Symmetry: D2
C-alpha cells in the first residue's frame, strides 16, 4: 500500500481523496490545508457535483476519521514543516496550485516525503506524464507533474490518430466547464480579464497551453498542435474538439475503428469509445480521461476531420493523479 499525503483540499484534492477510497493500492493518511478539520469534513461529506460521500466521516481531536481510518489534518503554509515522515507518507499529491516548480515542491521531500506528484502542469522543466501517452518514459524522478485535464484528454486521442494516420497539423478547442478560478458575477481577475466575467452568464474564451503541451508528452507531435478554450456555464465535464489534417487518407469509419481498437486494447481505461447519443452529464463521474464520441465528429474529406472526445475534468484527472502515484512507486 502506498501512503499518500494530500496538500490542498480543493476540487482536485477532494476528488483525489474520494477516488483513493475505491483503490486498495493507495491510502490517504494526511491532508494539509488552511481549513479546520470540521470544515474539511463538511466539504468531503457533501458535494454539489458528485453527491454525498460514500462512507463515514468523523472529526476527533482536530483530525479526521474516514471509514474508521485516522487522517492527520494540518494547516502549514510552509511545506517544509509538514513532517510527512511522521505519518509515513510515500508520495505527496501536491494540489494547491502554488508549488509547480522543483524548488517549491521539493519542500515536501525535505519534510519527509519520498516523491511528489503535481496535480497541474509544471511551470519549470519538471517532467509531465499523461497515462496512455508517456508513463513508460518515467525514469525514477522524485518530482513529477500529471499535466492538465485537457492535455490528458487530447494526448491519448492524438496518439492513436497520429500512430495510425499521421497528424500533419491540428487545432484544438476545448469547450470547458466552469471552474474555481472563475467568478459568479463580473468581478476582479486582473491576470485574465475575460475570466472575471460572470461564469453563469457567458461563453468565455480562454487561452490554454494544453494542446501545445501534448508535444511534451508526445515529442513526435511537438509543434503540430495548439488551440484554445471556451468556458461555458456547466459545473463539470468538458469536451475536446480536435480539427486535424492527416497524412494517410482515412474514412470516418476507419478512424472510428482505430479509436475503438485502442480503447479496447492498449489504452483501455484511459481512452473510451462510444457511439451513443451522449451529452456532457453522461460523463459526470467518468474515470476515462478521453471518451471518443463517434457520432459527434464529422469529416470534410479523408484527410481533414473534426474529432470529439469527452472528459470529466474533475474525476478523470484525479484518477490519473492516483495512477501516476502508483506508477512512480513501482
Amino acid at each position: 500500500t502506498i501512503k499518500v499525503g494530500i496538500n490542498g483540499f480543493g476540487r482536485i484534492g477532494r476528488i483525489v481523496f474520494r477516488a483513493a477510497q475505491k483503490r486498495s493500492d493507495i491510502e490517504i493518511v494526511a491532508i494539509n490545508d488552511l481549513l479546520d478539520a470540521d470544515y474539511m469534513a463538511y466539504m468531503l461529506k457533501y458535494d454539489s457535483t458528485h453527491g454525498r460521500f460514500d462512507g463515514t466521516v468523523e472529526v476527533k481531536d482536530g483530525h479526521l476519521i474516514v471509514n474508521g481510518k485516522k487522517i492527520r489534518v494540518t494547516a502549514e503554509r510552509d511545506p517544509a514543516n509538514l513532517k510527512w515522515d511522521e505519518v509515513g507518507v510515500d508520495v505527496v499529491a501536491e494540489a494547491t496550485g502554488l508549488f509547480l516548480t522543483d524548488e517549491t515542491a521539493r519542500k515536501h521531500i525535505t519534510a519527509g516525503a519520498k516523491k511528489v506528484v503535481m496535480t497541474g502542469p509544471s511551470k519549470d522543466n519538471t517532467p509531465m506524464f499523461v497515462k496512455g501517452a508517456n508513463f513508460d518514459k518515467y525514469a525514477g524522478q522524485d518530482i513529477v507533474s500529471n499535466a492538465s485535464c485537457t492535455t490528458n484528454c487530447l494526448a491519448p486521442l492524438a496518439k492513436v490518430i497520429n500512430d495510425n494516420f499521421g497528424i500533419i497539423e491540428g487545432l484544438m478547442t476545448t469547450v470547458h466547464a466552469t471552474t474555481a478560478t472563475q467568478k459568479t458575477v463580473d468581478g476582479p481577475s486582473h491576470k485574465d480579464w475575460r475570466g472575471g466575467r460572470g461564469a453563469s452568464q457567458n461563453i468565455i474564451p480562454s487561452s490554454t497551453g494544453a494542446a501545445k503541451a501534448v508535444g511534451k508528452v508526445l515529442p513526435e507531435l511537438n509543434g503540430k498542435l495548439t488551440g484554445m478554450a471556451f468556458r461555458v456555464p456547466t459545473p463539470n465535464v468538458s469536451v475536446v474538439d480536435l480539427t486535424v489534417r492527416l497524412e494517410k487518407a482515412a474514412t470516418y469509419e476507419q478512424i472510428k475503428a482505430a479509436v475503438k481498437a485502442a480503447a479496447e486494447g492498449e489504452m483501455k481505461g484511459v481512452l473510451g469509445y462510444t457511439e451513443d447519443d451522449v451529452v456532457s452529464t453522461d460523463f459526470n463521474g467518468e474515470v476515462c480521461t478521453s471518451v471518443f464520441d463517434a457520432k459527434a465528429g464529422i469529416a470534410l474529406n479523408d484527410n481533414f476531420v473534426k474529432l470529439v472526445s469527452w472528459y470529466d475534468n474533475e474525476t478523470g484527472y484525479s484518477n490519473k493523479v492516483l495512477d501516476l502515484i502508483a506508477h512512480i512507486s513501482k
Copy 2:
C-alpha cells in the same frame, strides 16, 4: 415606407418587430399568429433577454396599438386567408418555420403580399441571400430566404478570408446558445435524441448544415466547409470557431488587418472587428452578424489558423431580415 406583415410571433418575429421600430424605411402593419392580442402585447412588452419594449403597447378592439400606430392582429392557420392586401402589406416576414418552400410561402402572394422573406433556410431551391456574401446577386425574386443565424456569421467571415488568402478546406464549430427547440429537463425529442436532454445541465452536440450552406451563398466555397454545433446553457449569443487551411500564407496580424479593413469598409455594419477582452454577453443586442474576435483566435502557422467570430443569434439575424426586406424592395 415598406409595409411589412409578420407571420409568426416567436423569438424572430418579436425581435424583427422591435428592430423595425428603429428603422424609418420599414413599418410593421400586421402580425399573424395563434395568440390573442393581449398575450401578443405581453410577449412584446417583456423580454427576458432584451428587456422591456422601448415604447407603448396597448390592446384596442382585438388589435395592437404600438407607439400610437395600429397593428392588425389575426390568427389564421392558412396563409392564403391572411388578406395581406387589406393592410397594404408589401413584404411578409415569414417567421413560423412552417412555410419554407415556394409552394407554401407563395400563399402570402395569393393573399395579397408582393414579396416574402423566409426567416430560415429554405427547404427547396428558394434562393438564400446573406448580407456580406451575396446580396448583390439578388435579381428580382419575389420569395427569398435570409439563410440561418449561423450562416450569417460564417459567410461574411469566410468570404473575407477566402477572397484574400484562399480557403482550401475549413471545419466549423458553433458554440451556440440554448434555443426554443430545447428542453428544460430530459424530455422527448424523437428526431434529435441529444436535443431532448436538459438544456441548462449540458453541453449538447448538435448537427448543423450552416457550414455546408455557405456554398449556396458563396458558390466558390461549395464543398470546402462543413461543421457542427455544441448547444450550451446560455440564453442568447453564439460563436463561430472556424479552422481553415489557407492557400496563400498569412500571418495572424495580416489576417487581422484584412478582417478589420472589411469591417471598417465594404462590410461595415455586417462584419465587426474587436481586439477587446469580450465575452458572449458583450454581444447581447449586437446588430452585426459576425464580430471577429482578434484576441481569441490562434494560428498554428501561416497556413492553418483558428478564427473566432461572435453573433447575437436573435438580434443580428433579425436585423438582417429587415435589411433583406429593404434590399429586395429597392
Copy 3:
C-alpha cells in the same frame, strides 16, 4: 411480488422505474408510451440529473431487457387497449398526466389491471394518500392518487407541527426546481404566461394548490393553509418554506425536538431531519419526501415561526408512488 405496469415514461415514470429496481416487493413488467423501445432504452440509460442507469439495458424484438428481465413495451393511446392482463399486471403506475379521473384511469382496470396509482393529484374526488399523513386511511379503493411532490413535502411536516403545537393558520412558499412544463427561452404558454418565460434566466412566480391540498389528506388542516411557488433555475430538488402561527407556544428548540422525534420514529423514511449546512444538491437522489432543515428556519417568537423542508421532487415522490403501490397491495 407486485407486478407493475407503467403508463407514461416521462420523468416520474423513469424514476419510478429506477427506484423499483432496488425493491424486492415490486417488479416492473411493462411500460407504455409513444416512444420506440430503442428510444425508451436511451432515456432510461442516461439521465442528466441522476446519472447512468445502474444495470444493463438492451432492446430485443421491440421490447426491453433490463437486468436480464423482459419488459413489455407498447405504444397505445387508449388505456382500454393495454391488455395489462397479458403480462399479469397487478397495479398500474398511471404517469401520463392525462388520466387523473376515475372514468379515465378505470380503463386500466377494464384492460386487466387490478388497481391504479395516479402519479399526480386527482382532478375528481379520487382519494389521495400521502405517506406520513394518511396512508392509514386507505380502505380498499382500487384507484388512488399519490397527490403531488409538494404536498408530499408539506403534509408530513404540517402533521407533526399541528399534532404537537396546533397550526392556527399557515402560508407556504415552495422554491421549486425547473420542470418539463417550462420553456428554455421566452415562449408560448397561453394558460400560464409567467411559465412561458425562459426558465434559466428567471425567478418565476407560480400558483400551486399543494398547500390547500393538504386539507384533503389532513382534514383537520382544511382551510388553514395556502401558498405559492417560485420556479428557479435549478434542474431538480425543491424546498418548502412554511410560515405558521401556533396555538401552543413552542421554542425553536422544542420544535426541532418534535420534528427529530418523528423523523427518527413513526415517520422514519418519510420525514428526515438535519442540522447540517445543506444546500439543494445535497438532496439530489434523497428518498425522504420532507427533510427538515433545522438551521435554515427561524422563529420570530414562540407562536410564529418559519420552517424549512427539502424534497427531491423527482426521487422522493417516485419512491412514495412505489410505497403506495405496496400499501394498497397489502
Copy 4:
C-alpha cells in the same frame, strides 16, 4: 453639483457610477480601488448584466476620461491618504465593504471629504437610512449608511402595510440572485459554509438581518419582523416574500389599493406597483427599490397574507445610494 468619490469599484461602485451619469445633481470625480485604470475602464465598458456602457471611456496617463470628464484613479488601501479635497470631493460612496464603522469610514473625512455614505449596513451604531422609510430623520450626521438592498425592498412595503393595517408580526424570505461573495463551484467559505457551495447548481439558504433591520429604519416595527434568504442561480434581481398578520382586516383588493396609492403618491419612485405577469428579468435595470407584484401574492384570510415585491439588488440600491448622497447634501 455634488462631487462624489467612489471607494471600491465592485458591482455597487460600478453601478453607482453608471447611475450617476444620468443625474445632473451628482458628479463622480474620483475612483479608488486596487485595479489599474485600463482594467477599470474595461469593467465599466462591458457588463454581463447591464450591457455596454452608454458613453465614451478613455484611459490617459493613468486616469479615466469618461464622457469627456476627467476621473482621478488612485489605488490607496488607507483611506486617510486619498486626498479627496484635492479633487474637491463632497461625499464619498464607501463601497468596499471594509469600512462599515465610524472609525474606519471617518478616514475619508480625515482625507478631505465632508461626508461618507456606506453602501452597506453599518457594523456599529452608524445610522442607516432607507428612502421611503426614514430619510426625513437624517439630522446632519457626517457618516451614514444606506442599509442593504433587501431592507430597501422590505421597509417601504412594510411601512405602507403597517400604516394602513397594523403589522402584528411578519416573517420574510428573500429569494435572492447570486452575488460576488458566492463561489462558481464548491469552494472555501469558512464563515458561511452554505455560501461556498456552487452557486449555479444550488438553492442556498442564507441568514440575513435585513428583515430585523427594518426596525432600525421604522422603529414602530422593531421586534415585529425577521426572516431569511435563499440564494438561487440568477445573476441579478431578487424578490421579497413577506408573510404578515394584520391588526385591521383587509381584503386583498384593499391591500392592493393601499400599495398602489402609495406607489403613485408619497412613495413614487421608491415603491412601484404592477398587476402584470412579470418575472425577475422584468426588473433588470429597475430603479424602484420595491415593486409590489399584485397578482403574485395570496391571502389566506383578511388578517394573514403573503405579499411579493421585486427589487433589482444592483440597480435600485445603487440609485438610492445616490439619493442618500443628494439628501444629506441638502
